[PDB]
Write a protein that holds these residues in place. Structure first.
Motif, PDB file in Angstrom:
ATOM      1  N   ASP A  37       0.778  -1.096   0.018  1.00 45.82           N
ATOM      2  CA  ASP A  37       0.576  -0.381  -0.160  1.00 45.82           C
ATOM      3  C   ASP A  37       0.986   1.127  -0.164  1.00 45.82           C
ATOM      4  O   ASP A  37       0.714   2.185  -1.197  1.00 45.82           O
ATOM      5  CB  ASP A  37      -1.231   0.171   1.150  1.00 45.82           C
ATOM      6  N   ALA A  38       1.956   1.740   1.017  1.00 49.27           N
ATOM      7  CA  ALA A  38       2.962   1.989   1.344  1.00 49.27           C
ATOM      8  C   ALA A  38       3.936   2.830  -0.627  1.00 49.27           C
ATOM      9  O   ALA A  38       3.722   3.802  -0.769  1.00 49.27           O
ATOM     10  CB  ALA A  38       3.691   2.358   2.199  1.00 49.27           C
TER      11      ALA A  38
ATOM     12  N   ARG B 290       1.462   4.122  -3.455  1.00 44.80           N
ATOM     13  CA  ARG B 290       0.568   5.239  -2.830  1.00 44.80           C
ATOM     14  C   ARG B 290       2.267   6.008  -3.323  1.00 44.80           C
ATOM     15  O   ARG B 290       1.653   7.575  -4.293  1.00 44.80           O
ATOM     16  CB  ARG B 290       1.017   5.594  -1.466  1.00 44.80           C
ATOM     17  N   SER B 291       3.773   6.261  -3.283  1.00 42.11           N
ATOM     18  CA  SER B 291       4.691   6.056  -3.931  1.00 42.11           C
ATOM     19  C   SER B 291       4.096   6.452  -5.779  1.00 42.11           C
ATOM     20  O   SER B 291       4.858   7.221  -6.277  1.00 42.11           O
ATOM     21  CB  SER B 291       6.450   5.343  -3.294  1.00 42.11           C
ATOM     22  N   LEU B 292       4.585   5.625  -5.949  1.00 47.45           N
ATOM     23  CA  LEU B 292       4.448   5.004  -7.360  1.00 47.45           C
ATOM     24  C   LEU B 292       3.119   5.681  -7.511  1.00 47.45           C
ATOM     25  O   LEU B 292       3.087   6.861  -9.070  1.00 47.45           O
ATOM     26  CB  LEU B 292       4.276   3.553  -8.031  1.00 47.45           C
ATOM     27  N   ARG B 293       2.267   5.535  -7.132  1.00 49.66           N
ATOM     28  CA  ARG B 293       1.152   6.883  -8.249  1.00 49.66           C
ATOM     29  C   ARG B 293       1.624   8.589  -8.413  1.00 49.66           C
ATOM     30  O   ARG B 293       0.959   8.755  -8.920  1.00 49.66           O
ATOM     31  CB  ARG B 293      -0.665   6.452  -8.060  1.00 49.66           C
ATOM     32  N   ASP B 294       2.089   8.462  -7.063  1.00 48.87           N
ATOM     33  CA  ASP B 294       2.480   9.910  -7.364  1.00 48.87           C
ATOM     34  C   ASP B 294       3.480  10.662  -7.693  1.00 48.87           C
ATOM     35  O   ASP B 294       3.533  11.604  -8.071  1.00 48.87           O
ATOM     36  CB  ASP B 294       3.107  10.013  -5.361  1.00 48.87           C
TER      37      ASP B 294
ATOM     38  N   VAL C  90       1.229  -8.391  -5.728  1.00 47.66           N
ATOM     39  CA  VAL C  90       2.387  -8.228  -7.300  1.00 47.66           C
ATOM     40  C   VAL C  90       3.009  -6.560  -7.418  1.00 47.66           C
ATOM     41  O   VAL C  90       1.893  -6.306  -7.684  1.00 47.66           O
ATOM     42  CB  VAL C  90       3.253  -8.983  -7.405  1.00 47.66           C
ATOM     43  N   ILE C  91       3.461  -5.852  -7.549  1.00 47.29           N
ATOM     44  CA  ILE C  91       3.426  -4.474  -7.798  1.00 47.29           C
ATOM     45  C   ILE C  91       5.037  -5.095  -8.289  1.00 47.29           C
ATOM     46  O   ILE C  91       5.865  -5.592  -7.809  1.00 47.29           O
ATOM     47  CB  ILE C  91       3.895  -3.773  -6.526  1.00 47.29           C
ATOM     48  N   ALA C  92       4.909  -5.324  -9.959  1.00 45.03           N
ATOM     49  CA  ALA C  92       5.837  -5.112 -10.564  1.00 45.03           C
ATOM     50  C   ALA C  92       6.191  -3.321 -10.542  1.00 45.03           C
ATOM     51  O   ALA C  92       5.238  -2.657 -11.664  1.00 45.03           O
ATOM     52  CB  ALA C  92       5.353  -5.347 -11.919  1.00 45.03           C
TER      53      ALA C  92
ATOM     54  N   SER D 178      10.514   4.276  -0.806  1.00 45.36           N
ATOM     55  CA  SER D 178       9.365   4.057   0.252  1.00 45.36           C
ATOM     56  C   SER D 178       8.910   2.391   0.405  1.00 45.36           C
ATOM     57  O   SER D 178       8.508   1.867   1.361  1.00 45.36           O
ATOM     58  CB  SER D 178       7.961   4.225  -1.174  1.00 45.36           C
ATOM     59  N   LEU D 179      10.191   1.359  -0.234  1.00 46.75           N
ATOM     60  CA  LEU D 179       9.770  -0.503   0.838  1.00 46.75           C
ATOM     61  C   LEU D 179      11.059  -0.266   1.907  1.00 46.75           C
ATOM     62  O   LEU D 179      10.741  -0.225   2.431  1.00 46.75           O
ATOM     63  CB  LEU D 179      10.581  -1.346  -0.112  1.00 46.75           C
ATOM     64  N   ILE D 180      11.963   0.162   1.542  1.00 44.45           N
ATOM     65  CA  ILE D 180      12.732   0.639   2.342  1.00 44.45           C
ATOM     66  C   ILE D 180      12.042   1.369   3.463  1.00 44.45           C
ATOM     67  O   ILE D 180      12.227   1.505   4.977  1.00 44.45           O
ATOM     68  CB  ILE D 180      14.310   1.024   2.698  1.00 44.45           C
ATOM     69  N   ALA D 181      11.599   2.330   3.332  1.00 42.55           N
ATOM     70  CA  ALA D 181      10.366   3.387   4.198  1.00 42.55           C
ATOM     71  C   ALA D 181       9.588   3.069   5.096  1.00 42.55           C
ATOM     72  O   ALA D 181       9.263   2.836   6.114  1.00 42.55           O
ATOM     73  CB  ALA D 181      10.580   5.158   3.786  1.00 42.55           C
TER      74      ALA D 181
END
Ligand SMILES: CCCCCCC(=O)OC[C@H](COP(=O)(O)O)OC(=O)CCCCCC
Length: 504
Positions: free
Chosen positions: A10-11, A14-18, A266-268, A323-326
């Motif tokens: 989810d996090a 968000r980042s990718l869509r922003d 999954v997120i590609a 954002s994966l790390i965050a």
């Protein structure tokens, strides 16, 4: 609607869509209903690590290699219509080549006439012997009487000379239905026919996300088919009189939805590098870009990693990793060739990624970073499997970013010393392989909270390439990752841990 939440996915979404809303459905895509592709009696067989010979410095039992190659072959052998390979030049050789050839002949013996794309990125100077027409001719010879039924498009490509961009995504997608991706280049001498094999990891999946990956590849071949008008950028060789296939993966999807094969969400996510697309013009992304000069190296090139908002928008992979790390609330494992790049011509590190890790260390989140041994370093452009002379280059930079953040060096040390595990990679009790050479590590892996992980081609160190990988959220899958790869890597690599300067 029994499904468990995906706090981490989810996090990242968000980042990718922003950052890149306009690239959703091409260069990035979230999907439900994937399956981590494992055979019977081998439940973590979806995780394709090479050589997979833990605890043996002679590496005699290469169970990871065997499985990697059996899975490439078998995925290709199952093709009805399409095979889509991307890699970093050279084109696949040895057993990586045999997988493709055995696989295609099997498909033809099952009565099919598969269309095949093979795409490599080529650096502007090492190319290489790198020749599409010779490679295609070699496959045709090796394919025998089967060649008549196989439609090949074979290309090598460089998107930007001056900004050092070309394809380095490492993808094998079949019928837009299965995908194998990760860090493994098809280089037999580095991976297979050696007593000091490179340690790397791919993963194998099936499902809607396999289609997400093909969609990414059509994006690459659209540019590549178009730019064959410029032989400085693209070399292209087709077989059987065939046209260039910009659209192979759309043609194979046609008009029905991708059917789920499982329950894995999954997120590609990939990137367009430099010289394909300038920006996502539909993006509202407006960040405050970092500002911290590096004391070691002032990069000469326009810095696309740290000082270019437009590049972010066409390269969602950078922010997807950050954002994966965050999103890590308990712990993060980083397993990488490198975190720092070769400066010049690239910025030495990603300021924001390093800010992100220093925030974690300050917040008491456990950070583990394992990198390829500095002993692997060339040779400014070789490129050998390290870009540092010592692990202090990572921890000192963490320190510098911890000081920016908190104001005091003593707080810095409590967070660095207390919460960081930093080491070179080992796979047995021995300091180097039995033949004398150091272990080379080439993973591009991030795991967060034993919940969500990235396996793909995108390195954490600065690079402006076409990359791609997958993010999985699944406790079960991340348990298998922990047990099969991350625990064992820490088991043996803790022997080569750095105590940073300023720690007991
Ligand atoms: C003097 C050093 C400048 C290197 C050029 C840009 C880059 O990040 O390349 C890294 C890339 C990543 O590969 P992988 O996907 O992790 O396997 O390595 C290459 O693309 C090949 C290196 C050739 C050197 C270019 C002059």
């Amino acid at each position: 609607a029994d499904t468990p939440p995906t706090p981490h996915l989810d996090a990242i979404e968000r980042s990718l869509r922003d950052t890149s809303p306009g690239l959703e459905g091409s260069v990035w895509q979230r999907t439900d209903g994937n399956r981590l592709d494992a055979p019977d009696g081998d439940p973590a067989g979806w995780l394709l690590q090479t050589p997979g010979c833990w605890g043996d410095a002679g590496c005699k039992d290469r169970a990871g290699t065997r499985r990697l190659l059996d899975k490439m072959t078998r995925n290709i052998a199952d093709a009805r219509h399409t095979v889509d390979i991307s890699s970093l030049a050279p084109f696949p050789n040895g057993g990586f080549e045999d997988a493709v050839v055995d696989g295609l002949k099997a498909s033809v013996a099952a009565g099919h006439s598969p269309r095949v794309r093979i795409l490599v990125g080529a650096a502007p100077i090492y190319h290489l012997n790198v020749v599409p027409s010779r490679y295609r001719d070699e496959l045709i010879g090796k394919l025998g009487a089967a060649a008549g039924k196989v439609t090949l498009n074979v290309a090598s490509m460089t998107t930007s000379k001056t900004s050092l961009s070309w394809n380095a995504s490492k993808l094998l997608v079949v019928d837009g239905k299965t995908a194998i991706t990760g860090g493994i280049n098809g280089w037999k001498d580095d991976y297979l026919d050696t007593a000091h094999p490179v340690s790397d990891v791919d993963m194998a999946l099936s499902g809607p996300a396999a289609r997400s990956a093909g969609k990414y590849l059509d994006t690459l071949w659209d540019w590549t088919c178009r730019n064959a008008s410029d032989p400085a950028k693209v070399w292209l060789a087709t077989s059987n009189g065939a046209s260039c296939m910009p659209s192979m993966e759309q043609d194979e999807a046609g008009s029905a939805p991708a059917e789920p094969t499982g329950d894995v969400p999954v997120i590609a996510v990939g990137g367009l590098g430099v010289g394909i697309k300038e920006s996502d013009p539909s993006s509202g992304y407006h960040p405050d870009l970092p500002t911290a000069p590096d004391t070691k190296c002032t990069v000469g090139l326009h810095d696309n990693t740290n000082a270019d908002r437009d590049y972010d928008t066409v390269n969602p992979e950078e922010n997807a990793l950050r954002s994966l790390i965050a999103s890590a609330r308990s712990h993060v494992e980083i397993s990488q060739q490198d975190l720092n790049a070769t400066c010049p011509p690239l910025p030495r590190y990603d300021i924001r990624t390093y800010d992100t890790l220093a925030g974690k260390l300050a917040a008491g989140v456990k950070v583990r970073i394992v990198v390829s041994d500095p002993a692997n370093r060339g040779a400014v452009g070789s490129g050998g499997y390290s870009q540092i002379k010592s692990l202090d280059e990572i921890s000192d930079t963490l320190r510098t970013r911890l000081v920016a953040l908190t104001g005091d060096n003593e707080k810095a040390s409590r967070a660095l010393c207390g919460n960081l595990q930093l080491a070179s990679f080992r796979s047995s009790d021995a300091a180097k392989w039995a033949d004398g050479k150091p272990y080379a590590l080439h993973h591009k892996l991030v795991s967060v909270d034993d919940s969500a992980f990235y396996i793909g081609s995108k390195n954490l160190y600065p690079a402006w390439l076409q990359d791609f990988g997958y993010i999985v959220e699944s406790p079960a899958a991340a348990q298998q990752l922990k047990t099969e790869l991350l625990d064992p890597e820490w088991k043996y690599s803790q022997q080569a841990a750095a105590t940073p300067a300023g720690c007991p």
